[PDB]
């Protein structure tokens, strides 16, 4: 989830609006 | 300031700043 990927890993804008509402 | 390791606080910053008035949601599990 985010933390492995944000986290642990470069987080990225690709990966961050897949969060958003 | 979003290509970076982000934790905690740090991560929850981004995805304010990023989703703005959508929200988002922050499920660390």
Same mark, same amino acid.
């Given at each position: ?21 | 300031?979003?290509?970076?390791? &982000?934790?905690g606080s740090h &991560?929850?910053?981004? &995805?304010? &700043?990023?989703?703005?008035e959508r929200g988002f ?5």
């Amino acid at each position: 989830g985010i933390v492995e990927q944000c986290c642990t890993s470069i987080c990225s804008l690709y990966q961050l609006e897949n969060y958003c509402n | 300031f979003v290509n970076q390791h &982000l934790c905690g606080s740090h &991560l929850v910053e981004a &995805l304010y &700043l990023v989703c703005g008035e959508r929200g988002f949601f922050y499920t660390p599990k």
